[model samples]
Target chain A: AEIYNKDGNKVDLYGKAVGLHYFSKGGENSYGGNGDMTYARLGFKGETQINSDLTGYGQWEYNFQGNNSEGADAQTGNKTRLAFAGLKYADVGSFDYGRNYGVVYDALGYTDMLPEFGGDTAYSDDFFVGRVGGVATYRNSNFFGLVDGLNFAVQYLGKNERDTARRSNGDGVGGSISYEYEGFGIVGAYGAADRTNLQEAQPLGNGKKAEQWATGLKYDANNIYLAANYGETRNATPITNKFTNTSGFANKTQDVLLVAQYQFDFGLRPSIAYTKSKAKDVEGIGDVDLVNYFEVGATYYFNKNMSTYVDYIINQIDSDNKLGVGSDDTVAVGIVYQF
Target chain B: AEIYNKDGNKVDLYGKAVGLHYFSKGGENSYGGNGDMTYARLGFKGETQINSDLTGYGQWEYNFQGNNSEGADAQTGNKTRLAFAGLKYADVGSFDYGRNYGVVYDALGYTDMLPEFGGDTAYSDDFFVGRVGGVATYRNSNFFGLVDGLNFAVQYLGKNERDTARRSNGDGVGGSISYEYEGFGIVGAYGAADRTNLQEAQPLGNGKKAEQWATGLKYDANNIYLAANYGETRNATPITNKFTNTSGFANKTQDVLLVAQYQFDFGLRPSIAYTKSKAKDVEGIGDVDLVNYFEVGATYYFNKNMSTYVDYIINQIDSDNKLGVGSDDTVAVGIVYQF
Candidate 1:
């Protein structure tokens, strides 16, 4: 028989709920299937403190709005929201290894703006990629400022052992260094992985490597705040003589992001951003260029737990890839609340 | 062969990575597992707007971080992050039927202060219980003000016709309504379902119905802000018969929240909150009263894409259950960053 406790229970519990509303110029849209709140979910998490400094934690989350599909809009299927563990020393820092976010990816979540929903990454160009596994990260206690103002993080993504069969040396790693100074800050990172001989390697080149960097600044005056950021990424693969002309210059891909935001009193905030990307030159192939996105958005607060907002996004795709050469734009407006 | 471009000359690819981490308390000399990041994941989301109003979208997210068998530790296994699709309209609201957040759940996502990583419902009880499969919801467009601040939604849940012995009655219906007026807001919702005859069916008392209501108020002055909220819930079940208890009021839950925040000139915003909840007079179970939580947090913006935060939380649980036993007070400190 199970016992019920009046106080805190040892078992863990948690959950999340999300709603999305999208509108296009066209009459009827099929972008996010059912069209209502595209993604919603619920889950649970728990942890135990073994000793004074040592602790353990675990979590599980699942989408509640779909049929066993955990991926975001347009990407349907079971997925993982989080999974990892680590060790921490209050004054020193923490060391964690597992399926987790790279230092750069983790940094993206700090912004008040949306990265995956309607910001530069989704509207203009691929600004911030989602999280990845096979990571080793470290977070330090404040090393520079007051009690808890300064901190740093580093992540290492090792070889994807599962892909080693296709490429004997299919190893990859990336790291990020960041600093928070008063109201302004900066971050730099790079991720490179060998895709040589991988089972599903890109034909243009066998193995691949990529690097990215970003910086942001913020100002707060009275009841007003301003923020901005810029990012760039470059990816490439050396062509194999078997698939390309003998000259052997690597085929490359690059992307860039620029963003800005301002939030003020009266519960109103507005923002704008631009992004662009291009796949490097390849034999007989025109480069894939995407005028990634341009967008603006605002939020109106109806107290701390309730608010409404509108976001508009425009994307111009170059004729070189799929989706039939053209531009697309969308507007989304909805109300959200929290308890 | 799968191609990157429609020209069928580029390479098609697919890949994924997984990882884990653990932590040890520094001063206390305690050991425990902490999926420092909980549910690490990888996936992709893409969409094609066929026209101005008609469009297509899809997404796929995978979970590599598993559950932790031990306390505060992540487990090993596969999980899904997101997956779904639907059609939408710009002039009116949208309609979608799939697995997603219930009308009541969406409200929580907007107000909760927990980081998205550890804050999602899967790991916390910050929101309503989640549901799986075919949830129909409608999101209005500009229901009232220029802020686009009015919304109404409903969902229909179904059971397997073949599974006659299932606990569910083969169907459930739920809905919610919300409104925001500048710095003030209110939300109300209800969900109900019937049981099959084999499962012991009852009338107004036999079915499962849950109702909730919440309201909030907030004000921002210069660099300071204040907020407060209250919520109530009641269930119908009997005390004498467990089966009848499922229909009549056997348990009730109520909650209250209060928060205060101040923003500094240096891009830092510090905030504090207090939360209390009570579950009154359960059936065979006694009342569980006064579960309280206090938290202090701060955010330092480096720019829009990066920043860091540290928070400390205190919890006090009090119980009136049959055993009269409960846990003591607990404390926690954490730092998080998003790219």
Candidate 2:
């Protein structure tokens, strides 16, 4: 017999295992060639009905990419993946603990529509603007009516160590909010942390702090989908600065993205995307405005378990910025099978 | 026409991307609750047919886990996954460069009979060892006609700044061999690396030399399967003159694993596994004995896209030398769905 459940109440565990290889020959130094085989894993998520108005949900995942080769060393080992436990309370909302998504990122992921080598297409060099760690999170079940659609989330992260397996020291806090109605959604987020404890213990040196936020919109129709987003972050001392422009501003940076896609019969979907970011007075550098990136791809599905696709990616940077080696580009075609 | 031009030619690409959140409690007083969400990613892999007997493969994967919360920090950016390329001859072998796997791990993965989590049972403190950064590798397609395997691999990793994003920096070489006939298969592997390079590295310290080796056997028949393996590693560090029962040996270690599984007509698969690892003079703490683990699990498949399972795991550390406060045990149950 099939079970009857509430909206988004069916719990299931899912995992994705991925492998990739690529080649290229563009850029200033002919810096493109062959690539490597990587391991990407998905997760198992589930929920149970404790009562008509209450439910329990949890998730656990792991990263299998680390120790596949000779030079790799185990860091946190089993502690390397996402594992969390939480509860949902009908129409009010839900609260969860353990390791999970930060509010800002949770919203943007649903809309950022760019494809580069993986999901690294976000314009900001600092990647954690949309993350929250060690957070106690709360999401409103229905802040907005069926059409108003609003959800707010907040997280608290304790500063631990830059390296968990080695040392113990540091702390942090983060949060975000979103609104979705009809075919549009928008999000905003922020977070901050300081690792002053590992000062003398590890090679990372001194102390560090970071913060970021992003906002975006998505529109999906019967045959077409479109999304756009912008994000920014700030890091003080000992952190890779993402601020691309000086203007005498402290370490601050921003990123912008635009994406569009269309689906056709015969299991074909095509997509295109673009992104750019700028940092000001980053890491003592005058001001670096890193620009460049655009991608186009098409996917063809053969049955439910198999699919094939081809994609082209290009990245360029201001010649003066040492962070990037001028420009890079690549083209690839491949197939994926799942069981 | 279903393209038969590439029939015997295998073109494949592999890559992975992931996102994560981490949280922790209970450590020294100086250390408190730790938490954060990491990058989630997607990887792509591809192989091209160069000729009937020769092929080329490449891969490039990056981290896309974004920080969208208020607790975001700078110490968490610049995370790396995998980047490399290679060529293979169906009749001869394959060679690759740029961040490859060590030899010993490659062979073990192929012969491992336990579930993916089985490797974790052998961990002393964590789950599995990690991959090295910057390496060159080689593997023979096949050996004797009776046996489908015999291969060798090595890596030349240059030294780098300790605080940099690079993790593995060392020089090493290793090899592995396997023989399979009917339902029986066996494999053995060995490797050695410079200690001077590992010293001051996270988890592993610097020194002169380090070595490791292992052998495994597995049997499969009808609905039953069984497997076991043993391996050892030595770190080049002298024992301190402190303990009464010290082995007076450097950091020598040993590991063993056993697994058994049965599949039922009802789509139920039940399995049990055990693993152990012993290290002498662990963490410079005299003679630490063996750390052992056991796990049992049952999986019920519901067609191809869904399944459910329950797992129980226990870890024990002998009192010869205490590395932490106590042993650990956990039990978990969950359901999985795929698309």
Candidate 3:
């Protein structure tokens, strides 16, 4: 929502509230019977036209753990998701520095359009893989005002270390190129970083360097949508299935995702997705399964600002190997209000 | 700024950016030579008219530590400042539940208008004193729509425990009443709460119950503003001066604050304030002081949304006493932008 616009200055407020609940066959992935998944996000953005060809902008976003107690310890999900400020010059480019998404997501984000949630190509807080901190980025569109279907971005992430191994990142760089034409789009992205001492010391750590690359294509024409992605990462993925694999790091991993969605004339949309992630050369275990799931979902829009959805996830990993199905099959129902 | 308005529903976004730097004579709180005190806050609020006589509303605010690194540990100032939702019925009252300020601040807040910072009648996170979490509140104005210039509020705070004593709280209740006539207003507030076991075991613990009461009056008319407040708390004050009195708590505390401000025709405002907080009956130590200072400041407004101020603080604490001047004398200059 644009709240203020005057004298070449504009301010906007946007966010959403989700009331969600879910249950699982194994109860391992279930939220409470109550609306335990209930939460809200809020953000503000502003821009000032410094001159005829220059503009300065900034944005901030936050997540509120609305369903949990205000107790600091009991409420752990509240967080600052994004903060940045930058300037843009027409016919040149734009630059910004702060906590934001890395360019690697430009390729992996293709199959992330499950009505609710289902993505396997990237991990957050892992050196320019997904959403991260301490990153500076430069972006240009339309090939700097020459081409209509070409764009690119470059990012630099300074070392941001924390208490844990995967929770931190060393100096990194990322780049992505994207092209669009006739309702079809394609993208490629790559990132590499120096591994922190803590990360390199993990039992399954591969080397001092972490790297990832991916390519994706998407079609959005008529009432149909389809997308697919294939990606690989080395020593950059963390093993979350602690039950079977105690080693913290994955030596190497391959991930894939495919998505299909259809929107009807009415306010109804249906989506289907398949995703898989497999780890190779583990420290304690030779091979392992990280994520394997197929999901079916539908969303009904009441209006421009209100929506409801029901999503069912089926765990496809029957792997007897360790680290299988870290998150189990589940059903989620949610109502959302956004502005 | 009101961003959206449609069908009896409205949304607004507001917050500020403060660029401040200070240097202390004692060097206890001299920010880095760089602009380390720069930060920004943003919030969004929305309301829907349920009917001719009813309305529902919600708000969320967040703090951004813009002067520091995006590293989570390197930036400690980022946090969720407020989140709440409520409903209002005309002629009845308004009720809300979430993280918010307690009613005790209604009285103690009188002397808080220092153009920048200067207040001493209450503390944050000390239960129903200042800003807190897990609180429910109801407020009525004009004596339920019958009388003029009469208002009252009631609040309940649920137990919110954390890792420490002062950082946690037990069940609590608070109340405040106010009256206004001809640019003059008076307010009285009281709050009581059950001290957590951790608080009760403090080195200077006084009792199982923590209580506080305060009353204040203000006259605001024409170009002059004046206010004063006096208050007392029992077993609710935490000693911050760790050098002399390492004891965690104070048996009792007496706090006072006074303020004076005048606005000139040229968009300049000058302010002066005096504040004192004394702790009585320490544990291993004896009587002590917590805060004692007088501040003079002036603000110059460039426009409705932008201003700058310079302030000088004089420490009045001659106390060879312990727990004195946890914050020392300093000069602060700041610029603020609000929308």
Candidate 4:
């Protein structure tokens, strides 16, 4: 992916294009096939060796799905995926500013390796984590350890401002630590959000706070891989009711996921994964439901840069409420090409 | 362009960044200059030779104008430009699926080769026949003749679904053929939409189907180039309502355009183009007047990958309707960088 190499500096261009077609059924009466030309992206990265002990780097990535639909045009300005600039020191650490992945995601992201949505849990889908827009982070590798793969990171997301008099701003902090030795690795992460300004001035005068913690372990050897994770989230803002009254009543949720995959010599890899989640006192509704997801998939490679896969997922729910008692199924076939 | 190569497979990344400052004026009082960073884009492409007669390739392109505004953030997902995967067979043809250019655009695209908006005719700005999503195409070169430059293409766009219950799905088909001998070439194309399910159920229940046909010729020798095209669109949707009641009626419009450019031995290329369109009996509101547009521009190249240009466009309308009887003008200076 090298584009230029001169004057102790290098620039590289890289990205992946992915498209999928899916047949999904949510209940007895819902069934359809849809084409998704989303997830296709392009990126550019460059690094310059400023001195013997320091380097400067920057990266930009954008998705190509803005104009893939009927009414979606490119000029509406909603396509950027990642943009950041950073400096790395040889022995100390690295610091970055702008949009980037959260430290919690760095700890638990191994469970999200499926082609589509496989690790559906409170930690993966909740608010105040993931790729925060106004974020700054500091990370260090080989931090005072003989293990070369030991690393740690800390991040902060600044308060965001809105146009109205009421500010929708909240400050957040996250931290993570991980270590890898041979084929085995382990990671732990924690994140918290302070709603001192947001809840007091906005619609949510209830003064609620949110936090999450997660841990995971993984092993890889002989073309086979296995990973598992467990996470708990408390008082996190639900995605469906971002600024609504539902934020007044906090919900506590927990989930566990397991994934396994094996690669064959003949350009084929098969994988299986499962996840289960339980929630209690969701917005004061009381013991909402238990959700389970199962997935099986396989990928075939045409070359090192191109591959195709098919995945089938089954979602089941157990609940006391009649409206949420059902099972759903989804099957998708997709391809990805990277450069 | 080459990034990496191994085992008969190669990957490359390329794209351009373009920005413009525009000043426009129309009617009694309309004038302003704004910065437009809309045309910036990034792309990745790769190919793998499977055998002596077959090859596989993929490409993804995205616009960088997602967060181009003064306050917009990048994560809102507005990028997509083009995403497609295909296979090429030696001495046979190539087939592709996903989002791509329509055959009609392939034929008349030469007329659209300008620094800015000059050929604002039906084919370039109208709906349904530019870049069709959920499309499949087959193209062949050296078809049916000793002239190695003869080529043909056929494409189909499947029914696209909207979010609502009423589907905006309309299937379309298009075809084009072209040939080139020694620096002269000619192309013709036709495209049609089936209104079996669309138009009748949507906002315009008039049961009007749309179709367009176009032909063009071009010549290139040394540093000079010339091209001209004549195109007619039937029962197509108008981009704007010139008159109050004009949109209720289907207008049959025809247009002719001519373009010429000469590149000097130094670093400058001067270009000029003109277009005129006429409509007949629009929604029974009587015959509309002719629309004329003229453009002149020049580009100065700094190198093979960087350049700057300035363009001026004059827009004139002669109509019996009072609302359509004004003139407008636009001037723009832009720069483009490619890598």
Q: lDDT of each prediction vs. the true structure? A: 0.46, 0.52, 0.77, 0.66
Name the better of 3 and 4 by lDDT. Answer: 3
State the lDDT of candidate 4 residue by residue for B116-194, as single tens digits: 6655553312334465555668898898344599999888766555442122335678789998888998999888765
Question: What's the DockQ of model 3?
Answer: 0.07
Please name the candidate that would achieve the greatest TM-score relative to the true structure: 4
Ranking by lDDT: 3, 4, 2, 1
Residues A1-339, candidate 2, lDDT per residue (tens digit)? 112233434434344444545556642332233464345555545455546775665554544543255553432221224445565677777766544555556645754553224333232212233223344577774572353577777766544454331222245566677777777777777767554444433332223555567776788767788887776665522232223421212256666777788878678878887766666654445566554567777777676667777767665654455544345566665656544
Please say which candidate is ahead in TM-score: 2 or 3.
Answer: 3
User: Which 10 consecutive residues of model 4 chain B have the lowest summed lDDT?
Assistant: B26-35
Candidates 3 and 4 compared by DockQ, better number: 4
Ranked candidates, highest TM-score first = 4, 3, 2, 1
2 or 4, greater by DockQ: 4
Tell me candidate 2's fraction of native contacts, as a decimal between 0 and 1: 0.07
Per-residue CA lDDT of model 3 for A286-313, tens digit only, reads 7877778888899986545656689888
Q: What share of the true interface contacts does each candidate keep?
A: 0.14, 0.07, 0.05, 0.24
lDDT of 1 by residue, B230-325 (tens): 655544222222234233232465666677777788778776877666667654555654346566667676665455665545544443323232
All models, RMSD in angstroms: 21.0, 13.7, 8.5, 5.7
Supply the global lDDT for candidate 1. 0.46
Please provide, for model 3 over B2-32, each residue's C-alpha lDDT reduced to its tens digit, 9 standing for 90 to 100: 7689876788778899998766654554212
Best by lDDT: 3
Docking quality tier of model 3: incorrect
